């Protein structure tokens, strides 16, 4: 009865932690691609 309660608290703190981690990865991956695109544009402008 104690395990079941603590396990339910943990699982929730697991799931919310995993959802945040996934959201942060996706946001990271997007900001990489945009930074790389801006980096190419900046290199072309530097050549000009």
């Amino acid at each position: 009865n104690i395990l079941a309660e603590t396990q339910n608290k943990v699982q929730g703190l697991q799931e919310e932690l995993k959802v945040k981690m996934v959201e942060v990865n996706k946001q990271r991956e997007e900001t990489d691609i945009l930074i790389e695109k801006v980096g190419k544009e900046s290199a072309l402008a530097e050549e000009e």
Binding site: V10, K20, T31, E41
Partner: protein, 48 residues
Amino acid sequence: AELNARVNSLKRQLEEAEARKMIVEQDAARCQSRLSAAENLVNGLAGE
């Protein structure tokens, strides 16, 4: 002089975008380490 100033501003924005990424990456690595530690505790308390 205008082009040089634009190039410098873009280079600064990239270095900022790279630094922000590295913080988002290390925050993600911590959030994944917590997610794994939670998955360990799920497997821990579920098994029990």
